[PDB]
Amino acid sequence: ASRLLLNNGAKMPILGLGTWKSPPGQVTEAVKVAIDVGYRHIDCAHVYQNENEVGVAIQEKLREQVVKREELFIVSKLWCTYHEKGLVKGACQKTLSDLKLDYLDLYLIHWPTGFKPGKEFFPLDESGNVVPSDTNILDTWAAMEELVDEGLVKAIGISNFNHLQVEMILNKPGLKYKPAVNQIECHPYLTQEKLIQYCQSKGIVVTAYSPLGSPDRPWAKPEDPSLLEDPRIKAIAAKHNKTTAQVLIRFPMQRNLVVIPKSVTPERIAENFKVFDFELSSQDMTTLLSYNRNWRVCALLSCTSHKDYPFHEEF
Ligand SMILES: NC(=O)c1ccc[n+]([C@@H]2O[C@H](COP(=O)([O-])OP(=O)(O)OC[C@H]3O[C@@H](n4cnc5c(N)ncnc54)[C@H](OP(=O)(O)O)[C@@H]3O)[C@@H](O)[C@H]2O)c1
Numbered sequence: 001a002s003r004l005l006l007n008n009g010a011k012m013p014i015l016g017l018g019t020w021k022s023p024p025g026q027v028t029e030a031v032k033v034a035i036d037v038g039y040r041h042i043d044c045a046h047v048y049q050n051e052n053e054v055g056v057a058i059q060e061k062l063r064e065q066v067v068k069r070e071e072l073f074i075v076s077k078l079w080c081t082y083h084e085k086g087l088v089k090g091a092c093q094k095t096l097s098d099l100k101l102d103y104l105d106l107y108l109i110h111w112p113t114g115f116k117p118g119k120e121f122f123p124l125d126e127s128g129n130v131v132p133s134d135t136n137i138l139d140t141w142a143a144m145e146e147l148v149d150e151g152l153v154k155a156i157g158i159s160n161f162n163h164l165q166v167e168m169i170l171n172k173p174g175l176k177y178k179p180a181v182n183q184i185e186c187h188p189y190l191t192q193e194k195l196i197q198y199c200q201s202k203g204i205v206v207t208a209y210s211p212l213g214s215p216d217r218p219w220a221k222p223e224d225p226s227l228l229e230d231p232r233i234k235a236i237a238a239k240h241n242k243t244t245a246q247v248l249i250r251f252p253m254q255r256n257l258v259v260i261p262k263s264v265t266p267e268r269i270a271e272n273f274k275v276f277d278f279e280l281s282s283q284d285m286t287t288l289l290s291y292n293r294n295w296r297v298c299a300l301l302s303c304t305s306h307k308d309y310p311f312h313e314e315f
Pocket residue numbers: 017018019020021043044110159160183208209210211212213214215216228245246260261262263264265268271272298
């Protein structure tokens with residue numbers, strides 16, 4: 001297909017519209033044009049602060065007529081603030097409320113990373129770091145096995161999230177459910193060859209976030225790296241009379257992956273979905289993998305002393 005095989009027998013589309021960065025002012029149009037175009041998969045979250053407006057679009061595309069609930073794939077996540085098994089529960093409730101649906105297709109633990117509950121989405125040190133939470137990897141996994149049992153969510157998994165932390169959850173006693181998917185970032189400057197064959201190896205599904213390198217990331221500086229604007233990628237894209245975003249987007253798909261591109265911009269929603277027409281050669285595939293600088297983009301660093309920090313091993 002256009003559509004990978006979940007452990008829960010279900011069928012996830014290869015391509016979806018990301019929704020991180022997308023103001024409440026741009027996100028209903030973005031989603032309704034993605035639907036008229038053809039994306040049936042979307043990636044939301046409660047942090048994005050836009051879910052409610054993602055929803056109404058879905059809602060009027062449904063009730064207008066273009067799509068059926070069945071044929072959707074909505075994905076969302078658990079904030080760091082309700083790793084509390086007692087609180088996992090409400091977290092899926094007001095998101096499903098937000099969304100205006102009665103179920104969700106795949107639910108994520110947003111981070112390996114527990115922080116202390118209150119209003120603030122990121123409670124800070126008094127000096128540098130996040131105020132963590134005593135909460136627990138596999139004991140939070142359970143609070144959402146519970147969510148499947150109760151009907152709320154058809155399937156379940158992890159965001160980003162290393163070999164260690166994965167390999168814990170399937171060694172958990174009493175293990176009722178398997179993670180479906182491991183949402184990680186990937187792109188040409190981290191290819192992550194080796195948790196290619198752990199994640200997936202042995203045997204869960206990978207969704208590549210930030211496929212374009214994310215150049216509207218709040219910590220937006222560098223001076224330097226620039227996947228959209230890179231000389232040697234530009235030429236791949238020229239060869240296929242396609243664009244670089246296209247080449248970028250095709251790239252995870254072709255490694256057995258799932259891609260969530262974001263844009264709010266109707267032009268490039270409709271454009272970003274235009275990627276089934278070409279196959280990258282064996283050489284672009286070799287090359288765009290030779291580009292691996294090990295270079296993280298989501299990265300956050302007032303959380304770095306926290307025990308469950310994804311990015312402290314190599315895979
Ligand atoms: N679990 C996680 O921690 C996590 C973290 C990061 C990302 N994700 C998810 O994955 C999705 C994708 O990542 P992203 O938001 O990080 O970054 P991204 O999709 O790689 O990059 C977003 C930016 O690329 C620009 N763009 C997109 N298509 C383009 C095109 N054809 N030509 C030129 N520019 C284009 C967009 O412009 P405009 O949008 O300004 O038009 C936008 O600001 C997110 O929306 C999010 O839901 C998950």
